């Protein structure tokens, strides 16, 4: 019954082996392959990478911050890792909305994709349209109607909530393991408040790339041998998604390999 | 050097074998799997399925119609297979635009994603944002800011244009082979007018489904043995994408298996 982390790893080797040098926005070098996909069970397990230690706390507090729907950087650097622009959280909860500061009442503003997604699951779980999208701030002023950076399609069958994430770009060494843990968490959350059981998380990349300064660390991480994934426990019963707080989650069974810094 | 059609086929067997019954909008039955991906070379070949005959003409004339950016059904039923709503073509060329009839001058209106995509390739081919999106008409009146049905991310490296298509849903027996041929064509077109060489086409599905009334025909199509893919020739040199017409394309090397009707 093979390991899903064996996917991520394999993706790495491929981008290393058959990957092709490509320059990013900043003219920084990368090894790039176009179009990938990985499937990760959420059934009795949780995709917190083992081949290296993943900042689980920052993943949690970061998510909740998105769900709190905020634009306030200090509301995070004191919960783990002064106006911020409308990063994902603000989109998730009010896209279409006129963006003042971090402080004002946008209560009842724009479209609340995230509530909408939840709702749609309860109302019509066969729906092929349960989709949040998420922009890069850089893009907002840059042009009319810029393209999402990411989008999840959620999906439900036999009482099992699944989520597929599509990123136009994937930082494989630094970003990817994180998002895997994030959208896997998100899912778990939604599954929970909709009385559903977590299913698969599918991870689709456009440009999957590695930064040249990551190759070495990653070559070493490859030689590592994934311990079995942990589990994720919720310990209160929670009805509204804004009610979740960090207390509600226990990770259990997480013995990673040591941290691997990638700059 | 294996066949790409062997992918589509394999996807079929899986949805049959491990697929799970799910009800579509109309409460019609389907066998559904969530999250798939296939890669198809466009290098010296073209993904016109062989295990059955594909309506190549209708694929052509349909595309061109999109690119002509129209809302006029009769502009197609007399070129192959009275107002139509703003189907993909109109989005591709003017999303954001106020939609009158089929007849008016929307010249210079909304955002022309398709031109924009071309342009971005010439201006900044390392860009992670070369993305058109495409809506289902059904969805437009149905709610504020409905989710795309599809989106391509285009991508370029080593003088090779690639395209990945993401559909939230995939009709596997009827729709999928068609889109494969369509976005593969589109690509070829753009590659051509940007002095680029066609690369891969990646096909990502959310809900991949089969209609119960297709199972039998498909079970039979599985038993078939893919002949090698054809090629696609352009025979004029064309600079603007609105200049392409059906004359410009020869398919060569297409001996399919017989047509398979699926209702």
Numbering used by the authors:
A (entry chain A), B (entry chain A): 26 to 106, 129 to 310
Tell me, in the authors' exact words, what the paper reports.
To gain direct insight into the molecular recognition of mRNA by hTS, we attempted co-crystallization of the enzyme with oligonucleotide constructs representing the TS site 1 motif. X-ray data sets were collected and structures determined for crystals grown at low salt (100 mM buffer) as well as high salt (1.75 M ammonium sulphate) concentration. Molecular replacement with previously published hTS coordinates furnished structures with the enzyme adopting either of the previously observed active and inactive conformations of the loop regions about I108-G129 and A181-A197; however, each without RNA bound. In the active conformation, the catalytic C195 is located in the active site, while it resides at the dimer interface in the inactive conformation. Previously, it had been proposed that hTS functions as a metabolic enzyme in the active conformation but as a nucleic acid-binding protein in the inactive state. Structure comparison of native and substrate-liganded hTS suggested that nucleic acid-binding might be achieved in the inactive but not the active conformation of the enzyme. In the inactive conformation, the K107–E128 peptide is disordered and allows ligand access to the G84–K104 helix–loop–helix motif. Although the crystallography effort furnished structures of the protein in both the active and inactive conformation, co-crystallization of an hTS–RNA complex remained elusive.
The only de novo biosynthetic pathway to generate dTTP (2′-deoxythymidine-5′-triphosphate) requires reductive methylation of dUMP (2′-deoxyuridine-5′-monophosphate) to dTMP (2′-deoxythymidine-5′-monophosphate) by TS. The TS enzyme is an obligatory homodimer whose subunits associate with nanomolar affinity to form a dimer that adopts an asymmetric conformation upon substrate binding. Ligand-free TS protein binds its own mRNA and thereby represses translation.
